Design a protein around this ligand. Structure first.
Ligand SMILES: Nc1ncnc2c1ncn2[C@@H]1O[C@H](COP(=O)(O)O)[C@@H](O)[C@H]1OP(=O)(O)O
Ligand SMILES: Nc1ncnc2c1ncn2[C@@H]1O[C@H](COP(=O)(O)O)[C@@H](O)[C@H]1OP(=O)(O)O
Ligand SMILES: N[C@H](CCCC(=O)O)C(=O)O
Ligand SMILES: N[C@H](CCCC(=O)O)C(=O)O
Ligand code: NA
Lengths: 357, 357
């Protein structure tokens, strides 16, 4: 079997990575948990076994077959190249290596073929991107994609464990203490690294990550750039507005598309239903549509509210929901590892293509 | 001065109609509060005065100069024509009369001119529609509007007092009692009249109002049809996705437009800031954008995140927020009444144009 390491085991994604690995078919002989120095020494469960958390260092990756990273882009930048040097296949859940031409950016149902030519690092895409790709690929395959306009309704767990606790605390202060939402104190959201912080309780914050030079945030631009790489088509127009709402788990997305050829709605519904990883939840007569609360805990991506634009001949609207910690992160990563196993791609990489920092 | 009646004075909008009237310049000699049988006999304040709530009847409008309705479509259908017959000028905050050619559908900053030929009823547009009209009218005036795509982030107060209480209860059950969102019992949302009811706590519900036969909801279709009437241009392509989120007050909207002529963003920002009722909150370098929690209690409409589409030459994205009970309802209605007073338009209508039910 394999030696599997989880880097960032104590985090929000790391917790789900453990859960997904527990429920995985992957033949695991040895499991290892890695985090920062302050977590080292603590005990954490794998099934019923007790595992001691280790500190992530440059020499900690010897003998490891597969490493799942979700400890922020700074940890991946620093330790992933040393892992590859040690002969590990890295599945990275950060944005750091995503736009590197030597790194496959993979959603297994969409571009598993890209895994074959990997150089030791496989990048897991952004959570907001992944669920959109699962929903849209079956459409692209049959009728093509000209443009995408998406407005997101993102859960706070995407920003990590602290964001969840901040959201819960804020909501308690308003409902129990009667504090006006606009008077709340925030420490993390919208972006932990940005200069100013705003309450999320009873609010919709149109900022996820920091702003780029073009007045779109990095989150919005990641949706643009990642879609183009995943679907291997730079001609797909993508513009996004990414908004945080008071949901703890599961992203929701209002997705507008224009196809190359006119796509009959009932055929679109059927194509999405037939696509692996995508589940059609669309029966408006009985008020059936994807819901954040229903998607929590499931690996599947749920699609509904499918309808043609009222004016644009090739325009289609839809509603896409998936657990952001599962398909958006931990499950996509474990599924990548399972696909690597399937294809016999779990082995050391001879040529080191990533500079050691 | 005027005798002013508030129909639906006890409701979520009604409470704000009282506040807006209390802060109004309108010469009010007498105030009357009208509701249903179950509120009849109870007392509510107007400033320091105690006002006895009366049951709304076909004979309850004698001596009334102005009546502000917000008691549901059925109430307006039943009683508004009897008010018009009595000599009242009705400002109606329901969808019932909005698409009647004999009824002005007014946002005062946009189409106040339509008030002049009123036949006793002026319809206040849908709350989600109004704020979009305030943001986009200054853009339309200078560069035209070819199309609108909108995804909304709507507050629960739009669905009435019960929906607010349901939302607070559900959140309290999750946060204080540790109830799972899936296990919550809902009675009103997404739509009180519809067959099935879903939790809103930590959820995003892509249904507002009932579904129509084209698979768009009535809320989505009202945004489409009201836009065309208010802007007096049936050629403006409009498609909407309307979603309820865990917010009590203030709607947020991700608005995509394509103009007729290329609209420089810096000029677009200036045009919006110069438009009455619209405030520019757009300074991304300092993370300044409209927020629901900041908009609560303000009559203004806040616009930000203004940026051109990444591919479409004439495409512009923006973020629009306003208090749905104020500009979306109570303030727009009071502003209509004030504009009616300004133009000497508060007087009986000789010819009845509306059916007595
Ligand atoms: N320098 C680091 N090396 C290894 N892991 C890190 C480092 N910095 C942060 N992490 C881990 O990344 C994760 C962040 O997740 P979240 O955003 O949900 O808190 C945590 O598990 C955290 O572990 P630790 O608990 O030791 O800080
Ligand atoms: N048949 C009716 N006649 C007059 N007012 C009504 C009628 N039915 C409901 N209303 C009023 O419409 C408003 C609905 O508000 P909300 O949507 O916030 O619950 C309430 O003020 C309610 O008054 P009441 O309080 O007597 O039921
Ligand atoms: N999507 C971000 C978190 C994931 C950041 C990334 O992998 O690019 C969020 O919701 O805040
Ligand atoms: N906008 C609706 C309520 C107002 C219904 C209307 O005036 O047509 C909501 O948010 O639930
Ligand atoms: Na499927």
């Amino acid at each position: 079997g394999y030696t599997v390491a989880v880097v960032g085991a104590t985090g929000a994604v790391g917790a789900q990575m453990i859960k997904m690995l527990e429920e995985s078919t992957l033949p695991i002989d040895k499991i290892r948990y890695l985090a920062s120095a302050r977590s080292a020494g603590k005990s954490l469960k794998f099934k019923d076994q007790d595992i001691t958390i280790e500190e992530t260092t440059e020499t900690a990756f010897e003998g490891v077959d597969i490493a799942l990273f979700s400890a922020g882009s700074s940890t991946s930048a620093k330790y992933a190249p040393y892992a590859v040097k040690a002969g590990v296949v890295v599945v990275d859940n950060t944005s750091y290596f995503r736009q590197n031409p030597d790194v496959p950016l993979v959603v297994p149902e969409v571009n598993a073929h890209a895994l074959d030519a990997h150089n030791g690092i496989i990048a897991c895409p952004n959570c907001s991107t992944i669920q959109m790709m699962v929903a849209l690929e079956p459409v692209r395959q049959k009728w093509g994609l000209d443009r995408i306009i998406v407005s997101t309704y993102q859960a706070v767990s995407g920003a990590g464990m602290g964001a969840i606790l901040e959201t819960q605390r804020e909501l308690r202060e308003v409902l129990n203490d009667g504090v006006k939402p606009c008077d709340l104190h925030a420490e993390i959201l919208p972006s932990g690294g940005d200069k100013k912080h705003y309450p999320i309780a009873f609010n919709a914050l149109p900022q996820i990550d920091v702003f780029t030079d073009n007045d779109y945030t990095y989150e919005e631009m990641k949706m643009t750039k990642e879609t183009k790489k995943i679907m291997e088509d730079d001609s797909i127009a993508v513009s996004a507005t990414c908004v945080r709402i008071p949901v703890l788990s599961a992203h929701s997305e209002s997705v507008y598309i224009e196809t190359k050829e006119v796509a009959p709605i009932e055929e679109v519904k059927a194509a999405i239903a037939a696509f692996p990883g995508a589940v059609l939840e669309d029966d408006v007569a009985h008020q059936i549509y994807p819901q954040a609360i229903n998607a929590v805990g499931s690996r599947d991506t749920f699609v509904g509210r499918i309808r043609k634009d009222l004016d644009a001949e090739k325009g289609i609207h839809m509603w896409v929901v998936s657990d952001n910690l599962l398909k958006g992160a931990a499950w996509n990563s474990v599924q990548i590892a399972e696909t690597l196993h399937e294809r016999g791609l779990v082995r050391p990489t001879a040529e080191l293509k990533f500079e050691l920092k």
